[PDB]
């Protein structure tokens, strides 16, 4: 079972690094893939890649050994690197939703409105926010709880538990997850509404001669919307729910579950290439890249 658990960490890292390296490669190497949307996808893949190379491996050891082997500084840094990459990943998912919403519903306004220079600013902003919520508060000790038992883990270099004050766990969870989630729900809901509202106008046109039904394309778009919101929420909702719960009633949820829900979130980083890089141009580039 703990033999199975260690095997399961190995494939997680393998999938994350493989997938995300393959995406960045595809985009960087293929002129056809260097679009505006794929700029945001590139930001996402960078974030998830750093999760697989650094965040998850240092994580995997802390489960196996049951203690932090690299001293208090690298604990602090690894914690900051984790928070940064997760925040950048999820906030970038939120920007991709907005991007595709404009491109699908208001494509002509979008082309003049969203430039490559504007997208860079959006991307730079996302990472600057990730940095300021992770590195700034964690290195400067703002994330620290006053509690004596928490303060025992800060003094022990073998302890690298994630223990925060109230303010930080609320604020970081809102900024990394809840605001992005709300924006993703609102945005992708307007796509559904826009599509349903357009089918309504087609039926008004036909002078009571035809009523539209869901075709192949409408079922597929709705499945896609399902996978987008489903996998993102399944993966990160449990952990971020529990993360706020801990700040109030600390005993209620065990530590083995909390960490296991955080591992589920890292799984999303392996899922993202599969979801957001299915384009026929991506499918060609991937074959071309694998000989």
């Amino acid at each position, epitope marked *: 079972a703990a033999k199975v658990m260690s095997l399961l960490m190995a494939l997680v890292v393998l999938l994350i690094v493989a997938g995300n390296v393959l995406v960045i490669a595809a985009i960087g190497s293929t002129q056809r893939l260097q679009t505006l*949307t794929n700029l945001f996808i590139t930001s996402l893949a960078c974030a998830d890649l750093v999760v697989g190379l650094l965040v998850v491996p240092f994580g995997a050891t802390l489960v196996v050994r049951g203690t932090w082997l690299w001293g208090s500084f690298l604990c602090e840094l690894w914690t900051s690197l984790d928070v940064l990459c997760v925040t950048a990943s999820i906030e970038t998912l939120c920007v991709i939703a907005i991007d595709r919403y404009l491109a699908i519903t*208001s*494509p002509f*306004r979008y082309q003049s409105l969203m430039t490559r220079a504007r997208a860079k600013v959006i991307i730079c902003t996302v990472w600057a926010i990730s940095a300021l919520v992770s590195f700034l508060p964690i290195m400067m000790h703002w994330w620290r709880d006053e509690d004596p038992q928490a303060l025992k883990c800060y003094q022990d270099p073998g302890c690298c538990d994630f223990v925060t004050n109230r303010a930080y766990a609320i604020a970081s969870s809102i900024i990394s997850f809840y605001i992005p989630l709300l924006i993703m729900i609102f945005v992708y809901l307007r*796509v559904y509404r826009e599509a*349903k509202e357009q089918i309504r106008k087609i039926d008004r046109a036909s002078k009571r001669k035809t009523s539209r039904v869901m075709a192949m394309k409408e079922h597929k*778009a709705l499945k896609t*919307l399902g996978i987008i919101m489903g996998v993102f929420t399944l993966c990160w909702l449990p952990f971020f729910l529990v993360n706020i719960v801990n700040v109030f009633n600390r005993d209620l949820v065990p530590d083995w579950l909390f960490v296991a829900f955080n591992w589920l979130g890292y799984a999303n980083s392996a899922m993202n290439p599969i979801i*957001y890089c299915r384009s026929p141009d991506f499918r060609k580039a991937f074959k071309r890249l694998l000989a």
Partner: nanobody
Amino acid sequence: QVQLQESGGGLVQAGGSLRLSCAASGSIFALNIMGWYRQAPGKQRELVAAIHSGGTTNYANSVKGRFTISRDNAANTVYLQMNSLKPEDTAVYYCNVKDFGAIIYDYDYWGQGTQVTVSS
């Protein structure tokens, strides 16, 4: 299978008018762009005009004030009403459909093309 059937092209005297018409038979997502592109001999393909499912439009500068794109409210059919034609407009005109059904990316359909020749 999606197919695009082009009609309305041909020979016409300069100063005259044509009305292209592309009827898309197949499964298309409600959100989409139907458009006309053209390729003059020894030139690259260029956008003539395009109309989104919503109703917003986009026209090239050369055809502004002359050409008008509109779509059948019921069927997947898009019309380009070309007036004040000039010999410069002579090209193979292609019908294009951008399907947004995958959300993250757009799938493209192209017509075989229809010839339009304007003599002086």
